[PDB]
Amino acid sequence: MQPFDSGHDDLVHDVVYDFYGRHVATCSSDQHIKVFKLDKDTSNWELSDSWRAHDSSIVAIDWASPEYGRIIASASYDKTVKLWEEDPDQEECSGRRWNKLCTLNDSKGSLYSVKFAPAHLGLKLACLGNDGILRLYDALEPSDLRSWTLTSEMKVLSIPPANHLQSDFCLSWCPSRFSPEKLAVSALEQAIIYQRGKDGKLHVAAKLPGHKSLIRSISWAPSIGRWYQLIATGCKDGRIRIFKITEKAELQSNLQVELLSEHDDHNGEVWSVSWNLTGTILSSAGDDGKVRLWKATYSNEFKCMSVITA
Amino acid sequence: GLIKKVTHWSYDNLIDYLSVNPTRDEVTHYKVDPENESDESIIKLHTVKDFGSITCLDYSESEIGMIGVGEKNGYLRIFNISYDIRVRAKKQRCINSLGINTNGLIAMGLDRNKHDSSLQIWDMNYHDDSHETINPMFSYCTNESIVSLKFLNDTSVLAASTKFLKEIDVRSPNPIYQHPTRLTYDIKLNPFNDWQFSTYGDDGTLAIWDRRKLSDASPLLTFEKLVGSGAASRKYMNSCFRWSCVRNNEFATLHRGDTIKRWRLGYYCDSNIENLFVSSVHDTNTMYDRVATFDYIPRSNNGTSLICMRQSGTIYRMPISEVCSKAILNNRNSLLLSNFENTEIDEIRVNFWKPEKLLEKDISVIMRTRASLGYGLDPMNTVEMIDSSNAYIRNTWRWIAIAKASVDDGTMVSGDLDLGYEGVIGIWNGILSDKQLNKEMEKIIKLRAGSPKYVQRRLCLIISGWDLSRSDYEDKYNIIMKNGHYEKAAAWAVFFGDIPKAVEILGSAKKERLRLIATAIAGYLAYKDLPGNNAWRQQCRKMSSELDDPYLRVIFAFIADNDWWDILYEPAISLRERLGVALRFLNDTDLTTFLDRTSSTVIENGELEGLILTGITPNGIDLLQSYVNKTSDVQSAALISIFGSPRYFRDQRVDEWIQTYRDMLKSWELFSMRARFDVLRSKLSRTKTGVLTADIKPRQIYIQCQNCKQNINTPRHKYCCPHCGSSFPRCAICLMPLGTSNLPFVINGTNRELVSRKLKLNEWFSFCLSCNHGMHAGHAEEWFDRHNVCPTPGCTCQCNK
Ligand SMILES: [Zn+2]
Ligand SMILES: [Zn+2]
Ligand SMILES: [Zn+2]
Numbered sequence A: 001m002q003p004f005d006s007g008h009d010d011l012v013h014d015v016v017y018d019f020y021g022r023h024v025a026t027c028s029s030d031q032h033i034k035v036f037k038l039d040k041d042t043s044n045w046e047l048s049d050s051w052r053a054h055d056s057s058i059v060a061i062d063w064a065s066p067e068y069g070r071i072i073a074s075a076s077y078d079k080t081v082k083l084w085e086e087d088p089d090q091e092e093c094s095g096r097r098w099n100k101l102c103t104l105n106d107s108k109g110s111l112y113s114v115k116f117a118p119a120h121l122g123l124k125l126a127c128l129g130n131d132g133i134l135r136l137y138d139a140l141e142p143s144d145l146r147s148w149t150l151t152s153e154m155k156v157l158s159i160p161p162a163n164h165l166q167s168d169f170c171l172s173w174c175p176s177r178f179s180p181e182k183l184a185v186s187a188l189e190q191a192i193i194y195q196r197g198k199d200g201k202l203h204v205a206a207k208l209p210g211h212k213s214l215i216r217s218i219s220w221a222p223s224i225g226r227w228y229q230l231i232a233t234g235c236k237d238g239r240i241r242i243f244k245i246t247e248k249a250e251l252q253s254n255l256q257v258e259l260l261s262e263h264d265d266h267n268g269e270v271w272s273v274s275w276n277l278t279g280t281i282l283s284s285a286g287d288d289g290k291v292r293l294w295k296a297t298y299s300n301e302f303k304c305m306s307v308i309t310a
Numbered sequence B: 001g002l003i004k005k006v007t008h009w010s011y012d013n014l015i016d017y018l019s020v021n022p023t024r025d026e027v028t029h030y031k032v033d034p035e036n037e038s039d040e041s042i043i044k045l046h047t048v049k050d051f052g053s054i055t056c057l058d059y060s061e062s063e064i065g066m067i068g069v070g071e072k073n074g075y076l077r078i079f080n081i082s083y084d085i086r087v088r089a090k091k092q093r094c095i096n097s098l099g100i101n102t103n104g105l106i107a108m109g110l111d112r113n114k115h116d117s118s119l120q121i122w123d124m125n126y127h128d129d130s131h132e133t134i135n136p137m138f139s140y141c142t143n144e145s146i147v148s149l150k151f152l153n154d155t156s157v158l159a160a161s162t163k164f165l166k167e168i169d170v171r172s173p174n175p176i177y178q179h180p181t182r183l184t185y186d187i188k189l190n191p192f193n194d195w196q197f198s199t200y201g202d203d204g205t206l207a208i209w210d211r212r213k214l215s216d217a218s219p220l221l222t223f224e225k226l227v228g229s230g231a232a233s234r235k236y237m238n239s240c241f242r243w244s245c246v247r248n249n250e251f252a253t254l255h256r257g258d259t260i261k262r263w264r265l266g267y268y269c270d271s272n273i274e275n276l277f278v279s280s281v282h283d284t285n286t287m288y289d290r291v292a293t294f295d296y297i298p299r300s301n302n303g304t305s306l307i308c309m310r311q312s313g314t315i316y317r318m319p320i321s322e323v324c325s326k327a328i329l330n331n332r333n334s335l336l337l338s339n340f341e342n343t344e345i346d347e348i349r350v351n352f353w354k355p356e357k358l359l360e361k362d363i364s365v366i367m368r369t370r371a372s373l374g375y376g377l378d379p380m381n382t383v384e385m386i387d388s389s390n391a392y393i394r395n396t397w398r399w400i401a402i403a404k405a406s407v408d409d410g411t412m413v414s415g416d417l418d419l420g421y422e423g424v425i426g427i428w429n430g431i432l433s434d435k436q437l438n439k440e441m442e443k444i445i446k447l448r449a450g451s452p453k454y455v456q457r458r459l460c461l462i463i464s465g466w467d468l469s470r471s472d473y474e475d476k477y478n479i480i481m482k483n484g485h486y487e488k489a490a491a492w493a494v495f496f497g498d499i500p501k502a503v504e505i506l507g508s509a510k511k512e513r514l515r516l517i518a519t520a521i522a523g524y525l526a527y528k529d530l531p532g533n534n535a536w537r538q539q540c541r542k543m544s545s546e547l548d549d550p551y552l553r554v555i556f557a558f559i560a561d562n563d564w565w566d567i568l569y570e571p572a573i574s575l576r577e578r579l580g581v582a583l584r585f586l587n588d589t590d591l592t593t594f595l596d597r598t599s600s601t602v603i604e605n606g607e608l609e610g611l612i613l614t615g616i617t618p619n620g621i622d623l624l625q626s627y628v629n630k631t632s633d634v635q636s637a638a639l640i641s642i643f644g645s646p647r648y649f650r651d652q653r654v655d656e657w658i659q660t661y662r663d664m665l666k667s668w669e670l671f672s673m674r675a676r677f678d679v680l681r682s683k684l685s686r687t688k689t690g691v692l693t694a695d696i697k698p699r700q701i702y703i704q705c706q707n708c709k710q711n712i713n714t715p716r717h718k719y720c721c722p723h724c725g726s727s728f729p730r731c732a733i734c735l736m737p738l739g740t741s742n743l744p745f746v747i748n749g750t751n752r753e754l755v756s757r758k759l760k761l762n763e764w765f766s767f768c769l770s771c772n773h774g775m776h777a778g779h780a781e782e783w784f785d786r787h788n789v790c791p792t793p794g795c796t797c798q799c800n801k
């Protein structure tokens, strides 16, 4: 557990890898985005660029697919999503290495999660804030990546949550190009799987049951070729719910939800859950100060492994 | 019980603290070391007793030691810990609130008296020591009950009555604002933003305010029933809510004496006033129960510790645990950990289990290392890789090498028959006519009886690589012995029935244990005539039961009770070597039963050695699907599948595996290995006729001819338009037509084989996709080493970068 200091003056909120795994982008409450690179010679995380992005605390950033370039989206509490393209003819650690592309001002609420779509669906994007509205933005103009048009606008929640109540919203796409377009959308305590119907509009496809309290993180397991899709869920309870999704009106194919396993090992709130490249290791972080790794041994049932305390 | 953190008194790293016992009798001065989590870090300095009943407490920041203590009887006592004067109002009444400013100015909040002010502000330097009553410089709030007050700066005071919330400046005789609210208790300024303060009410409704909103009026936040009740009825209340002095936009609350909720707030400006909302609440269980009040201890690296006073007056120190906020993985099995407290980020690289060993033994890094080493591009190379560094993978790649050699040499290509990568089950079970299938099977053996199905056994021996001669048997014995594997050679000799040859091979070995095993095996040749049931047979059975080497276990289990069913059912030995004795030393009546049981085992279990039986048929794809479900080894599944999956049939599962492995190769930046995989897919899709079945990458160049304005793609040394014959557009540097090799000159653009390859690579077709101007590759490399503009006249396009 070698630590490296990122250099933020406040709480680091979202850290995300890129596709190649040699770049990390960290956003924090100091209204800054820092991109770090891993040199093959020094083998240490060195800062590439740090620049001020928003007027509030940035809470969600995501990398785009590398076939569309170097694009970083960024969601903050100032109700904006800003897109950042990198021009390589600029100096590192200067603040001008990443150029702004667009501001998505359509959100009437502080945004919580932004996830890019898989590359086979285009240069799409997803938004979710404290107004219950799921917004999809597409880059339909190929000449310039500054005109991102809103395509879909759903309503996950009937009314926005109150000012004094905490809320959490998480997003997860389905990284399979051999299945219809899906989007795992988490409300306060509701988890919804969407589908793109034949009419070109998103429809409610399945609902993951349970979830007695707030959902902190949703992670779709990568489609390695298996016939079942796996969704991991971290709740405000101590529950790490893993759903087994099998796929076979105005939807391309119906799909069923089976709760594969449910674990109470954290005795707290599972703040984040994440998958591996192959979807064989499940990393969960809770309030016990422990990061637990999970694997499936001898069957489909997931069992615990190495526990990392911090 | 009151705990009051004190700043600007200690020049060292220690933080001063002031405490009041729950019986409100004494003032204890503490000194807590922030970097030591032990209970002995709370150092008791001095205790000032002889107080009646303390209702409020305040300290002076400028002068060290000066502590004001109010009381319910009416006497404010100003004294020192690190003089002693009792002062009171003209009319004696309870001091609800007290504030001492930095410039020595002292305010006072009293109860309701109709003939006296409840906010009396005075300086101690102009106080006559001969009288107990104070002479106030500024008096405010007559006929009111000031229950909380706070000094915002050197001149203004933010006072709270029982029905109003005021901000009074001493340079004016009029309050700045008077907002009517019932939440007017325990004003706490935010240390990171003076405009934000925070009161609560009698029902427990906490409210965070903004002074700019009240000046101009709603509270900025409100929490119904968050803190304790009875503010108006009870005068002796424990402050169960503290602002965060470690970071902004955070506060902590005490609930039921057991948990502490750190509410982290978020802000947005509707455009300077920030509208707040609750983002995350973090709950921390207290070390001991029955906690009445608490306060913050700042540590280094944005740490947090909470000094807590229990209901019995015991003061203890409790840390705040480092809770991980995000544990993201990688394509290299690298874990990245982010905390909820500090800034630094922890990383667990790959270089209850250990984390490093569990990430090192996952298949996402095993597949990465194998793809780095070149796994699957040539089956003999895979076998040599595995043998130089999970034994079923070597067996299935050995079978794949044998079958690929059989296909490539035309042993299965010739005839009106495919028979390509077909397993033992498909040959043995039959399936246009029965005589037609018999004669096409016969012509394979007639290229290089004693049984009803004899030619099928010959084809199954050809597929399984078990049609070697006696000289080839001796050559295989020598090859196996040359690797130091004497036990494998003895097992191979016993498998073909040459038990004396196994005795000879294991004789004169390099191990004493092997020589003892050789003597044991040699004690059979004269014993084969016996009926048996000896103690020696029992010794051999026990030795076969206890041995760890599977080949010697095979020998000792076969020598005693010499039947073949005790060898060809265990999973310790390879299925190819099991079929080497099932197709050779067994009869067709039970061979179909054995093949059916083994096929039904390997289809649902998902063993890669079942490809002996199923081949690369659709049943082989089902076996590979079970293997992917069991192990998530999509790399081996894809490399096995591409030998026959587009060539002989078409299914979506193999396309999914190929796309997944290509995406993983892209994610590991192994682009050269991905290209080698693509050319291997294109090479292995050639049918017997020769038609490609692979979905190759489509064309990206459709050059428009300049003379006829038509597509040239609707000549190994010179490319021209097929419609008219006109040459390609000229190079921008040398004005020669592009697309032609062997130019009259040498393009020496910016180990003789690599030099010649570079020279013949310099004369290619290179062009910019922004200005559409063509160049030779060497000409473009030599031009842009000195310039930065397109060489064509009239074009301003920096094609380099
Ligand atoms: Zn032409
Ligand atoms: Zn040229
Ligand atoms: Zn040009």
Ligand SMILES: [Zn+2]
Binding pocket: B768, B769, B770, B771, B772, B773, B790, B797, B798, B799
């Ligand atoms: Zn150009």
